[PDB]
Amino acid sequence: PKPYVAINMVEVRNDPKTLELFGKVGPKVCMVTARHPGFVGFQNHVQIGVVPLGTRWGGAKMEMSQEMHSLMLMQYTFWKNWKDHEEMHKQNWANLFRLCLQCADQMIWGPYEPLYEIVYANMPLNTEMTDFTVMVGKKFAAGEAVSIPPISQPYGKRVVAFGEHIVKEGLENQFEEYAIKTLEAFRSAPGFLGGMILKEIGVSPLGSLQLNAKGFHQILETANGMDVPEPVTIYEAPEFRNRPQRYIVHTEWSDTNALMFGLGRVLIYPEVRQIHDKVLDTLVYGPYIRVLNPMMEGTYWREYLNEYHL
Amino acid sequence: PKPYVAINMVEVRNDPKTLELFGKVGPKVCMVTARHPGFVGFQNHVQIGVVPLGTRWGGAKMEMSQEMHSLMLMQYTFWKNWKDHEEMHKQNWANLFRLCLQCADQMIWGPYEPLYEIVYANMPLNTEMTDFTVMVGKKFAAGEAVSIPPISQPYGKRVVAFGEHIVKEGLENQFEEYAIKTLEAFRSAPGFLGGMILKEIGVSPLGSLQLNAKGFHQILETANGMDVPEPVTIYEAPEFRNRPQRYIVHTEWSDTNALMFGLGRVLIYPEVRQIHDKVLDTLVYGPYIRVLNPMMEGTYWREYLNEYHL
Amino acid sequence: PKPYVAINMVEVRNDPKTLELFGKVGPKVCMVTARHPGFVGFQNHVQIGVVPLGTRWGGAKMEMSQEMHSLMLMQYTFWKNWKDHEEMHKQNWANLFRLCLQCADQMIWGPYEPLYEIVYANMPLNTEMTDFTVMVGKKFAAGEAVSIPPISQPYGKRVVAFGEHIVKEGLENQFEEYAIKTLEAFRSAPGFLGGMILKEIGVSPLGSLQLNAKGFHQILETANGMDVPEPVTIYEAPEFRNRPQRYIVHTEWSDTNALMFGLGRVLIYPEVRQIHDKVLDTLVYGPYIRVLNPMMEGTYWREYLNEYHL
Amino acid sequence: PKPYVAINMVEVRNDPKTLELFGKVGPKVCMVTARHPGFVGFQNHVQIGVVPLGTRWGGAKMEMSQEMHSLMLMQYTFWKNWKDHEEMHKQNWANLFRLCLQCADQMIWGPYEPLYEIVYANMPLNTEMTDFTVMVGKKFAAGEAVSIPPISQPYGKRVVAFGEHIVKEGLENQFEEYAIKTLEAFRSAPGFLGGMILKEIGVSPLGSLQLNAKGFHQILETANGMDVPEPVTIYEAPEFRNRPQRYIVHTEWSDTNALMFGLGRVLIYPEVRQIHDKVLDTLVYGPYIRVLNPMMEGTYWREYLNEYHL
Ligand SMILES: [Fe+3]
Ligand SMILES: [Fe+3]
Ligand SMILES: [Fe+3]
Ligand SMILES: [Fe+3]
Structure with missing residues (x-):
């Protein structure tokens, strides 16, 4: 089935101390999260750049992570x-x-942890380059050679385009129809590894460290978390649902060149350009596309999504 | 059939003199060992690190071999x-x-050479990246596309997780049942190249240089081995069988990232986590997982195991 | 009386951060341990080398701690x-x-904390070089000049030979008889400061951090120990008793030269060599002798052992 | 059909001037040679090392070309x-x-140009890594999936083992029978890309610059070849046929590690070792194995050999 996505967004310093926290805290959070049976997986990202779209954001590059003082993480x-x-x-x-x-x-x-519903998903199983013989062998034996997916390599060997779209009130049905048609058109692009459309449905208060006045002071006052605040919030997650409607268009690409010319088909390929013009006519904000690197992954979430493993 | 494994364990210095002994003595030992018709192959390892499991062994890294003064070898x-x-x-x-x-x-x-019995084995034939066209062509012509193995590259192009488990007396049947189910669950993990479960059945006295009192003194007294000790031992191999029962869980992975998140499924994937909880409830010691690099290999031992070559 | 010994064994990194943990954590563990009335003392060791025994382990030296990346601790x-x-x-x-x-x-x-029973002990009171006037004055006034012990200096001013022996089933009575006679023969060696024979009787589960499946996950998941696991183990200490029987032959020496030629009397002194040949005829593994430096000590454990202080 | 091989052997200096002669003279020789309709292709090699076989030639390495003053070429x-x-x-x-x-x-x-007859050949078509989709697609459409060859990459991306064997008079039938069986056994080795057995049948006089006395002096006297010697020789090619019979065992491997452990199966794999023992019992000289790099190739000679292209 289609799972729900929580996207934890943090800005951290870009220093060698922070990359120690990727391997010494990150796995522990995933292990605490896996105590719940409704947890089906994870995918952790570091922003490495921004799609400049010519000179629209000309100070930005697709690979600018070596020069930034701070790192954006999307978990x-x-x-x-x-x-x-x-x-x-x-x-x-x-x-x-x-x-x-x-x-x-x-x-x-x-x-800051907004919650998302998956509107559309074409997200294949992650396979290494050593695993494609198993993948095409199982699909040929099942008579499904026409639905053999591309090789989507896990653990930092692909890039993610994180497309932020804010859609005008009343035009959400027009966005979802033609953003789906745009993602089906990306199937022809070289290096396209799959895509999904996320629709924001709320913001987690505990995941955003948003407590009441007593809880907020206990967050500031505690020594390394030994003094745990009482987790009383003033709202539940659908009470912080941003209007107008936020959408994430999440697409995966084999490299940044495949991303740049693949996503660029909404500007340079005239048949896809008319499709994505209907998307652009619904937007009050966007499109702004961040480039993400999926370092740490729980790739079995795609086994839950596609109802099939290996 | 399933062969028996002798695992020769030595600690040697990490210096350029030692890596000359890999190529000037190692092949000669394999050639003397191949005088016996019961010899079906070999696989030589160098330990390159330890799985830290978050901060459980936080001073250890998966790739720490450039900093170590001494090398652990598993032959x-x-x-x-x-x-x-x-x-x-x-x-x-x-x-x-x-x-x-x-x-x-x-x-x-x-x-130190303990002897092992293979309890379970899913160990495919080693193929290079130039050989997969032969592998999938032979399996398609035989109608066995569903059993096409992953590309397991020989000679240092994959990593080995060496999982040490000591199981309480009486719980050996519960270990072997659910450690098998854990290794079948690893088939879904990306980069999993196969696995086997080894059960210690004894320790070779001659392979451990364990002689009687006269033989031990001749080992210390000899000039470069020209004075050969009389190979009289005080025990045979099943007389040194360690109780409680030692198990090796040997799994092979395409890289250390695939190893870390693949083996990590017993901590972060909730369906595999309940399976491996039954393994953990039988252990008096472990799990402690060393990361090994299979440098020198006699890959035809998998031809004997799988009863098929090429 | 003869106390029981728990030997906590850890491998830690050899870096300046680790030697801060000797003085900032080590004393706190001893203070928590001293809450129990059955605690009678401690002796903490760092391995500084291995007895090479000629070229048997020729890559090892008695003083090699300046070159090692990792430190073995025996507490x-x-x-x-x-x-x-x-x-x-x-x-x-x-x-x-x-x-x-x-x-x-x-x-x-x-x-890893195995538990030991003291089979034999000749372990004198630790005295500084400023204290021998008190020691020989008290023994002369009591008419016990024949039992004046050697000056065993505390806190890093002597070395320990840590002799690992694994004895075949049924030959434990022959080991203990002639290993005692070997340690009485060491009384003639210069620089011999005393000795004891330890027999493994079990492994502490809580000291080895060996819990059940829920406790093991709470060890991996906790943030600096603030989330304490429930200390439920699947075994008690005599249920993990290694067979065949492990023995530690612990001898203390004034320096490494006195250790090398003193322990070497089982190879070069023909009267002691026939005694220790009966020890060698019981061994399935060993002897392997580590060289330890006793840095931090609770020297009043010898006051309990010898039933006399000062 | 099976072509005949002329192997031009020269020793040249290892300097940057010589590698200019690879690209400025080498192609011109191939273009003059292609004026004849019986020319079906070429394969040019540079020796990069020697198989040491443990310490049999311990001063030699498989990759020693960066240290040599002179280069052996086999064209x-x-x-x-x-x-x-x-x-x-x-x-x-x-x-x-x-x-x-x-x-x-x-x-x-x-x-020095000896002439060779191909006794046995298993030499597939050279394909790049971009061409294997065409190769397996054509073989599946023709119903020959069982005869899909390995990916043998041209132009320096594989290594050649050049095995020199001199066989006693009368034992040439025993050599050719069991050297063929050895090369069929190499089909199971990982990274084996194919093999052929060459039998020397003569030496080309003009290719070896061996003229009569007047022609030899005109070779020494000429200014850059403007004064062309009259090409009169004192012998034809079968009149210089070396006795006892020279054989080349030519095998191709994906890398030098695959070569070392693949060819090493005649020493370490006991089933192949008995086969190659019958080869060794016919030899008055050898085996001496040079490691060659096939830089410049006319890969369409395998199209003539296998009677099929693409
Ligand atoms: Fe969350
Ligand atoms: Fe052995
Ligand atoms: Fe303890
Ligand atoms: Fe020629």
Whole structure:
């Protein structure tokens, strides 16, 4: 089935101390999150750049991570229902608060965790280059050679285009129809590894460290998280649902050149350009496309999505 | 059929003199070992690191071999019966003792050679990236497309997870049932190249240089092995069988990232986590996972195991 | 009386960060351990080398600690009964787990805590070079000039030979008889400071961080130990008793030269060589002798052993 | 059909001037040689090392070309009949002599051109890594999936083992039977790209610059080849046929590691070792195995050999 996505967004310092926190805190958060049975996987990203679109953002590059002082992280977690994510944060609040405060001396902005519903998904199983013989052998034996997916390599060997779209009130049905048609047109592009369309349905309060006045002061006052705040919030997740409607267009590409000319088909390929013009006529903001590197992954979330493994 | 494994374990210095002994003594030992008809192959490893499991062993890294003063070597030899290995060491004792003493000025600990029985094996044929066209062509012509194995590249192009498990008395049947189910669950992980479960059944006395009192003094007294000790031991191999039962969980991965997130499924994937919880409830020691690099290989041992070549 | 010994074995990184943990965590562990009345003292060691025995381990030296990337630590604790050690770990589990996890980012292997019974002991009171006038004055006034011990200087001013022996089933009575006679023969060697023979009787589960499946996951998931695992183990200490029988032959020497030629009397002194030949005829593994430096000590454990102080 | 091979052997200096002669003279020689219709292709090699076989030639390495002062070149030309090669050299003698004398200030030994008959051949079509989709698609459409060859990459992306064997008089039938069985056993080795067995049938006089006394003096006297010697020789090619019989065992491997452990199966794999023991019992000289790099190739000679292209 289609899972629900929580996207944890943080800005951290770009220094060697922070990349130690990728391997010493990141796995522990995933292990605490995996105590809940509704957890079906994760995909963690570091922003490496921005699609400039010619000179529209000409100060930005697709690979600019070596020059930035701060790193944007997008940590996806996938859930059977979005209430499973809110139940996970409440039941594991002491362990998760203490782990998140280990990243405190690196954190610049955040955490901010909007919740998303998957509107459309074409996301294949992640395979290494050593695994494609198993993949095409199983699909040929099942008579499904026409549905053999591309080789989507896990753990930092592909790039993600993170496309932010804010759609005018009343034009959400027109966005979703033609953004789907745009992503089906990307299937012809070389290096396209798959795509999904995410629709924001709320913001997690506990994942965003948004408590009431007593809880907010206990966050500021605690020594390394030993003094755990009482996890009382003033809102639940659908009460912070941003209007007008936010959409993420998430597409995966084998490299940044395939991303630049593949996504560029909405500008340079005239048949795809008329399709994406209907998307552009619904937007109050966007498109702004961040380039992400999926470092740490829980690739079995695509096994839940595609209802098939290996 | 399933062969028996002798695992020769030595600690040697990490210096350029030692890596000359890989190419000037290592092949000679394999050639003396191949005088016996029960010898079916070998697989030689160098430990390159330890799986840290978050911060459980936080001073350890998966790739730490450039910083270590000493190298752990695990030299597997594969045998039609474990008595063939003990017969080989007795019949070729003078040549093997002299070759092992060429590594003497580098050796820090060892040699220690426990003998193992293969409980479970899913170990495919080793193929290069130039050989997969032959592999999928032969399996399609035989109507076995569903059993096409992953590309397991020989000679240092993959990594080995060496998982040490000591199982409580009486819980060996529960370990073997659910460690098998854990290794079948690894088939879904990207970059999984195969696995086997080894059960310790004894320790070779001649392979461990364990003689009686007269033989031990002749080992210390000899000049470069020219004075060969009489190979009289005080025990045979099943008389040194460690209780409680030692198990090796040997899994092969395309790279260390595939190893870290693949083996990590027993911590972060909730369906595999319940399976491996039954493994953890049988352990008096472990799991401790070393990361090994298979440098020198006798890959035809998998032809004996899978009863098929090419 | 003869106390029981728990030997905590860890491998840590050899870096200046680790030697800060000797003085900032080590004393706190000893202070938590001293809450129990059955605690009678401690002796903490760092491995500085290996006895090479000619060229048997020729890559090893007696003083090689300046070149090693990792340090082996042997932390002895002495107990009136071995159940007092298991009762101490359960009652002080939260404080001890949190202190042990301060060493986590340095730890490579371990912790592993086998429990030992003292078979034989000739271990004198530790005296400084300023204290021998008190020692010989008290022994002359008591008419015990014939039992005046050697000056065994505490706190890093002597070396320890850590002799590992694994004895065949049924030959444990022959080992203990002639290993005692070997240690009485060491009394004639210059620089011999005393010796004891330790017999492994079990492995502490809490001291080895060996919990059940829920406890093991809480060890991996916790942030610096603030989230304390429930200390439920699947075994008690005599249920992990290694067969065949492990022995430690622990001897103390004034320097490494006295150690090398003193222990070498089992090879070069013909009267002691026939005695130790009966020890060698019982061994399935060994002898392997590590060289240890006793840095931090609780020297009053010898006051309990010898039933006399000063 | 099976072509005939002329192998031009020269020793040249290892300097940057010589590698200019690879690209400025080498192609011109191939273009003059292609004037004859019996020319079916070429394969030019540079020796990069020697198989040491443990310490049998321990001063030699498989990759030692960066340290050598001189380069051995083996330039294969393939012919429909060996008389076509002798007819080519006589008809194009002025152009070929002038091109060969452009390499004169680099040449140390040679040229020496023995002629060979192909006894056995398993030499697939050369394909790039971009061409395997065409190769497996054509073989599946023709119902020949069982005979899909390995990917043999042209132009320096594989290595050649050049195995010299001199066989006793009367044992040539025993050599050819079991050297064929050895090369069929190499089909199981990883990275084996194919093999052929060459039998020396003569030495080309014009290709070896072996003229009569007047022609030899005109070779020494000429200014850059403008003064062309009269190509009168004292012998034809079967009159210089070396006795006892020379054989080349030519095998191709994806890399030097695949070569070392693949060819090593005649020493370490006991089933192949008994086969190659019958080869060794026919040899008065050898085996001596040079490691060659096939830089410049005329890969369409395998299209003539396998009677099929693409
Ligand atoms: Fe969350
Ligand atoms: Fe062995
Ligand atoms: Fe303890
Ligand atoms: Fe020629």
